[PDB]
């Protein structure tokens, strides 16, 4: 009964960089950080996949 509010979505705690990592919850937070930083560096290939 005391609940005054609820989180709108489960993604709201992260940003648009770490929200693109599937199975983030199973990754060590350092490795999620590195995964996002490295998604920011990926070069566009000839064809998207």
């Amino acid at each position: 009964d005391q609940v005054d509010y609820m989180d709108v979505s489960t993604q709201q705690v992260v940003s648009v960089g770490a929200s693109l990592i599937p199975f983030l919850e199973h990754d060590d937070a350092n490795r999620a950080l590195m995964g996002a930083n490295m998604q920011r560096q990926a070069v566009p290939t000839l064809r998207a996949d």
Partner: protein, 1358 residues
């Protein structure tokens, strides 16, 4: 050419001698024509021609006019190289004070005039007057007059009277001082004084005055009248994109000093009013100060973009200055960089170098080969051939790369194995292929790492690379004896899979005719790699005089073990490959091969190990899945039990039974226990997971699970990371080393919901911050260690010293960590080790303790060996080979010349930095123990106690009332088998000298609180306490009782600051109950935040806890928090509550007890009775009025200052203390460092000594001089009939020891370049450049390696 560097003050005559022409105009370039101005900062007649052998106006443009000076403009036709070294000068309109000597802190000018810095600053910058030649007036010499005082003096003392203002006044004061006369008065006053602070000031003044007198300097030269000007090419104007030139910094400063100087000259030409010229003089002084050292005075003047200009001081000092940017480390030609790859096919001595970098690096060699073979007569032709990459220059490249080593270096060269020489193999690619084995040495993973290739050019450099730096020579780490080329992760996994067994596999039980048969069976598919069989193995034992003796037998082994045996060399035993062969097993295998066979067999064995491990790891197909991280079935119930425990502890806390800190500690400990239980259950379910049978009953075996198979083998990961994968991942730690009491209940195979993935980010932020922010501490520490210990080089082979240190096995409170085998290995003994039985010489006096001698000691069960230490060496300027011991990079004694100081500094500094940057490898999980609370003896044996003063309580249980009680489990042979630390206030089940059996506790206590147990019985009195400010009392009205907490110095009131709450035990009549047979009351002082649950006047018994102080939490105990302790140890920091020791032995007596600062007195038997000590009465005293005391005995408890240990217990005591203290920190982190490095660092710390009696020598009374110099002077004196001067050794921090060195170049390159240079200039110091750093800076052969012979020859041929 030269052999020393002389530094001294630059007199105006000397400055004029340097300069080739006065600079007069503040213009550099016309900005329309790029020619230099007439007589500006950039000039041609002053500084030289712009172009080589060409006049400015073009009158002469050829070498035929080399020397003549054109009359049209006046430019000496010569090369432009001179323009790089031709200085100029500026004739300052008024004298100007040099800022360095004004604000050096201490200020040279300030204390040469015996004037405070504030007043001399006021005088210099034209805000007050100072009197010169006061004469028969109402004015003193150094007295100061403001504008009002100056007006009063002028109107009242218009007669002969001089009170100047500004730098001219200071120069007049300096010139009007007789240095020797002042020395006489200051010295005779020092002998006729009584104070101590004034004594220090007077002796400092005398030292400065004597430094000035001895050197050729003069005081007035400290005030600049002629300002030198740097040669233009060192402050160049380089064109920027467009017409605009580079906005140089020195040019602006020089050009706004000429402006003020010219303005002031013009004003003085026309006799401007005094105020305007005064302000102009002040501005000139400020401009010169900014030029010499910008920002030192304040208001760092900033150019365009508001960036402070880089002054000369800023250019020579700091990390971006010349010393640490262009002289100690330089950019080098013949160097390239590239990403690194694996290339497993390489041998240990070769590296894959790309063809393109190979061509680009070896261009001159290719040109030489082309000229030699006649394919290109002129170098232009050869260059053209190379740039086209013709088919023939590649053959030249292969021919010239054959036997030309290349250095490969990774960026953080933490230790000497970060740069190693390899033979290049030309590779078709763009990445360097680096051997897998050396990666561990480089710390080079292949996830984007880059490495740099350098090419040795000269024959000496190539041979040094081939014979010193080849990867096949660096088998053993220089920090310890362990191998460094141990196979890392894939090879060890392959070997672990190969050498293993299961109860039932293909081809089990069959008898094989040899390893070759085993390999044939495995390849043919008839037998599994891991199946128990019998194999006829022939092993070679060389127990004879170097003769390998064969021995054939039938070993019960496996197919994989037999196959691997084909790779082992001859001399090794078979049992070396009859185990699971984890990573440690393989490391021991390589080490034993090295010690028994040699180097080449070890290199070949390592290469074959790598190949076979890779091959069989590939064959095994060892993969990782999601079903391999099996969750334990006991995890949930452990979690529930821990949650019930935290719930009940919280319930107790809300009732007030416990305070917040101890509740937090208890929660942390119970969660750590639950995490350990979960990890243990996980490993139990994981290791024996597989039960396999098809021939009868079930038989358990060690699991083939991939996660376990990789964790057990030591390939990658440990208990912590697999625990986080499968078991609960436990507590986290914040960046400030604070543990989040909320655990994480889910592993990584399970979710980690949003809330749990928010606590984790705290630990992840901690791990990444410690990598990027707290690595500067490790780097700074290792730089200090290197710069304090760099000149220390092995010089002699044996000094013939019989002194040493007693090495014993170390048991810090648990089981043996480093047995005597590892503490005396490869070190020369000091005295004969007598057999433990009866006075039988077991090893001679000067035998190096190698493996056989250590095993002999083990089988004879020796407990303590005295060995020669570096710190106890009688060699001047170095260390003989014997006192150092084994090289630890090779198996022999240290070679005569090898630089052990740099090696020691690197060895001590590398693990700290590496672990600091590796802290993020466990996420952020806190490393925690169970907090003990008991002592479970494991083995039968007697129990003895040392440093113990215990009392029996009401229940007959012995209670320890001492701080440093050591409980030793001794064996029936008298050997101390175990040690334990008994905290102050522990209850002992057994007593002293009482037998015990394994597995039964002998001591228990409460780790979260420090009690205040008494010594006698009686009633309790809250003496010298007042409610409100001395204690905070909490009233329990419903119960009717009350509690109270002592509030620490922070909380108590300043009014009545010194109120000491104490519990005084008193008898029924109301008088203090004296402790047994003494003369002082039995009162116990309460420290801050002490929880007293008693009530005034309550009956108590002996051995009862009056109060309990919460012990406060200790955060994550990793390297990041322990490294500061090492830094404090090597810096010799005085602890905040040092233990007071007894200077002299004798009987003890308390004296006046003056004011709450009780006086102690030690009266020897017949020596100096009247020695006295001032001991505050608020701290405890161990010794009272009755007993003997040896010097260096503890009068009170607490941390011991290393200075006191050195002064009282001696050099060996302090070096042992430092070694043990730092080794505790490095053992906690699992760092293996030989004590040789710490011992040599300690030696470098205690390298100075202060004289106490001048004796017959020429030293002063209380000066500090190099211990080596005083020792050699005493040796020379005792050679004749005189008597040497007695000295006292001092302990200095690494920073102070490095800065306080005979050579000013080494200290200048180190911190405090300004201060070091100022002191050197004032003292007129002379540097012999006999160290390593000085020779690096100067650019000559190092006196450590191959250059040691050259330097010795030069000394002989001086």
């Amino acid at each position: 050419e030269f052999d020393a560097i002389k530094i001294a003050l630059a007199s105006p005559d000397m400055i004029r001698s340097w300069s080739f022409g006065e600079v007069k105009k503040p213009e550099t370039i016309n900005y329309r024509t790029f020619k230099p101005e007439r007589d500006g900062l950039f000039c041609a007649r002053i500084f030289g021609p712009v172009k080589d052998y060409e006049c400015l106006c073009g009158k002469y443009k050829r070498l035929k006019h080399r020397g003549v000076i054109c009359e049209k403009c006046g430019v000496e036709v010569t090369q432009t190289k001179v323009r790089r070294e031709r200085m100029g000068h500026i004739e300052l309109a008024s004298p100007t004070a040099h800022i360095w000597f004004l604000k050096s802190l201490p200020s040279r000018i300030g204390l040469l005039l015996d004037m405070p810095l504030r007043d001399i600053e006021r005088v210099l910058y034209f805000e007050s007057y100072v009197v010169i030649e006061g004469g028969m007036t109402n004015l003193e010499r150094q007295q100061i007059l403001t504008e009002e005082q100056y007006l009063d003096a002028l109107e009242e003392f218009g007669d002969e009277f001089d009170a100047k203002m500004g730098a001219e006044a200071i120069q007049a004061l300096l010139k009007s001082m007789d240095l020797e006369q002042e020395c006489e008065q200051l010295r005779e006053e020092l002998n006729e004084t009584n104070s101590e602070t004034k004594r220090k000031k007077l002796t400092k003044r005398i030292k400065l005055l004597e430094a000035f007198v001895q050197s050729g300097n003069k005081p007035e030269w400290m005030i600049l009248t002629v300002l030198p000007v740097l040669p233009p090419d060192l402050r160049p104007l380089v064109p920027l994109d467009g017409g605009r030139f580079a906005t140089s910094d020195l040019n602006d400063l020089y050009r706004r000093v000429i402006n003020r100087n010219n303005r002031l000259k013009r004003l003085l030409d026309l006799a401007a009013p005094d105020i305007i010229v005064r302000n102009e003089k002040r501005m000139l002084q400020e401009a010169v100060d900014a030029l010499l050292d910008n920002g030192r005075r304040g208001r760092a003047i900033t150019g365009s973009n508001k960036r402070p200009l880089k002054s000369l001081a800023d250019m020579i000092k700091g990390k971006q200055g010349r010393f640490r940017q262009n002289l100690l480390g330089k950019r080098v030609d013949y160097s390239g960089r590239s990403v690194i790859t694996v290339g497993p096919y390489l041998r240990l001595h070769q590296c894959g170098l790309p063809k393109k970098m190979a061509l680009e690096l070896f261009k001159p060699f290719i040109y030489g080969k082309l000229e030699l073979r006649g394919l290109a007569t002129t170098i232009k032709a050869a260059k053209k051939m190379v740039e086209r990459e013709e088919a023939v220059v590649w053959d030249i490249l292969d021919e010239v790369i054959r036997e030309h080593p290349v250095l490969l270096n990774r960026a953080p060269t933490l230790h000497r194995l970060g740069i190693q020489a390899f033979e290049p193999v030309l590779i078709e690619g763009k990445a360097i292929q680096l051997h897998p084995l050396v990666c561990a040495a480089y710390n080079a993973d292949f996830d984007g790492d880059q490495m740099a290739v350098h090419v040795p050019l000269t024959l000496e450099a190539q041979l040094e690379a081939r014979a010193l730096m080849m990867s096949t020579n660096n088998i053993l780490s220089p920090a310890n004896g362990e191998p460094i080329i141990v196979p890392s992760q894939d090879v060890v996994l392959g070997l672990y899979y190969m050498t293993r067994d299961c109860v039932n596999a293909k081809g089990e039980g069959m008898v094989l005719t040899g390893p070759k048969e085993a390999e044939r069976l495995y390849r043919s598919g008839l037998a599994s790699l891991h199946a128990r069989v019998k194999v006829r193995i022939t092993e070679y034992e060389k127990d004879a005089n170097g003769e390998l003796v064969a021995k054939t037998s039938l070993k019960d082994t496996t197919v994989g073990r037999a196959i691997l045996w084909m790779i082992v060399p001859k001399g090794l035993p078979y049992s070396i490959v009859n185990q699971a062969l984890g990573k440690k097993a393989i490391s021991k295998m390589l080490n034993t091969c090295y010690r028994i066979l040699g180097l080449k067999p070890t290199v070949i064995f390592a290469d074959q190990i790598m190949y076979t491990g890779f091959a069989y790891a590939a064959r095994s197909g060892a993969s990782v899945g999601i079903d391999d991280m099996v969750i334990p079935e006991k995890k949930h119930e452990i979690i529930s039990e821990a949650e019930a425990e935290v719930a009940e502890i919280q319930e107790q806390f809300q009732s007030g039974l416990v305070t917040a800190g101890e509740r937090y500690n208890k929660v942390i400990d119970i969660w750590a226990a639950a995490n350990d239980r979960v990890s243990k259950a996980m490993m139990d379910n994981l290791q024996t997971e597989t039960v396999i049978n098809r021939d009868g009953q079930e038989e358990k075996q060690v699991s083939f699970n991939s996660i376990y198979m990789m964790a057990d083998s030591g390939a990658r990961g440990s208990a912590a990371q697999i625990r986080q994968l499968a078991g609960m991942r436990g507590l986290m730690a914040k960046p400030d080393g604070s543990i989040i009491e909320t655990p994480i209940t889910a592993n990584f195979r399970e979710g980690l919901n949003v809330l749990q993935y928010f606590i984790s980010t705290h630990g992840a932020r901690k791990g990444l911050a410690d990598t990027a922010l707290k690595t500067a501490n490790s780097g700074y520490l290792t730089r200090r260690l290197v710069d304090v210990a760099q000149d220390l080089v092995v010089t002699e082979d044996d000094c013939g010293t019989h002194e040493g240190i007693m090495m014993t096995p170390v048991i810090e409170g648990g089981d043996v960590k480093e047995p005597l085998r590892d503490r005396v290995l490869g070190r020369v003994t000091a005295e004969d080790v007598l057999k433990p039985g009866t006075a039988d010489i077991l090893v001679p006096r000067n035998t190096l303790l190698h493996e056989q001698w250590c095993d002999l000691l083990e089988e004879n069960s020796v407990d303590a060996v005295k060995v020669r230490s570096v710190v106890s060496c009688d060699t001047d300027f170095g260390v003989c080979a014997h006192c150092y011991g084994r090289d630890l990079a090779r198996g022999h004694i240290i070679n005569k010349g090898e630089a052990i100081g740099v090696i020691a500094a690197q060895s001590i500094g590398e693990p700290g930095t590496q672990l600091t940057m590796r802290t993020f490898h466990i996420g952020g999980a806190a490393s925690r123990a169970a907090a003990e609370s008991s002592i479970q003896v494991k083995n039968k044996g007697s129990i003895k106690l040392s440093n113990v003063k215990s009392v029996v309580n009401s229940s007959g249980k012995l209670v320890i009332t001492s701080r440093n009680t050591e409980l030793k489990l001794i064996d029936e042979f008298g050997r101390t088998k175990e040690s334990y630390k008994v905290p102050y206030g522990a209850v002992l089940a057994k007593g002293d000298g009482e037998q015990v059996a394994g597995g039964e506790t002998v001591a228990n206590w409460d780790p979260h609180t420090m009690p205040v147990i008494t010594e006698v019985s009686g009633f309790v009195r809250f003496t010298d306490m007042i409610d409100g400010q001395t204690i905070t009392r909490q009233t329990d009205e419903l119960t009717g009782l009350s509690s109270l907490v002592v509030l620490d110095s922070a909380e108590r009131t300043a009014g009545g600051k010194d109120l000491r709450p104490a519990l005084k035990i008193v008898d029924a009549q109301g008088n203090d109950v004296l402790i047994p047979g003494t003369d002082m009351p039995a009162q116990y002082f309460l420290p801050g935040k002490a929880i007293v649950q008693l009530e005034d006047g309550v009956q108590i018994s002996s051995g009862d806890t009056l109060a309990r102080i919460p012990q406060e939490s200790g955060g994550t105990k990793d390297i990041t928090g322990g490294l500061p302790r090492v830094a404090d140890l090597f810096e010799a920091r005085r602890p905040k509550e040092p233990a007071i020791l007894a200077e002299i032995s004798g009987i003890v007596s308390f004296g006046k007890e003056t004011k709450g600062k009780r006086r102690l007195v030690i009266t020897p038997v017949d020596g100096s009775d009247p020695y006295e000590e001032m001991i505050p009465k608020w701290r405890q005293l161990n010794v009272f009025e009755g007993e003997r005391v040896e010097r260096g005995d503890v009068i009170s408890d607490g941390p011991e200052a290393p200075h006191d240990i050195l002064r009282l217990r001696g050099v060996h005591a302090v070096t042992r203390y430092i070694v043990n203290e730092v080794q505790d920190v490095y053992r906690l982190q699992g760092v293996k460092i030989n004590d040789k490095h710490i011992e040599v660092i300690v030696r470098q710390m205690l390298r100075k000594a202060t004289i106490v009696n001048a004796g017959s020598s020429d030293f002063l009374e209380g000066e500090q001089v190099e211990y080596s110099r005083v020792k050699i002077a005493n040796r020379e004196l005792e050679a004749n009939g005189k008597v040497g001067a007695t000295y006292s050794r001092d302990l200095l921090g690494i920073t102070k020891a490095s800065l306080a060195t005979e050579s000013f170049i080494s200290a200048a390159s180190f911190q405090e370049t300004t201060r070091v240079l100022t002191e050197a200039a004032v003292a007129g110091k002379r540097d012999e450049l006999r160290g390593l750093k000085e020779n690096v800076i100067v650019g000559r052969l190092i006196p450590a390696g191959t250059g040691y012979a050259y330097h010795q020859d030069r000394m002989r041929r001086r």
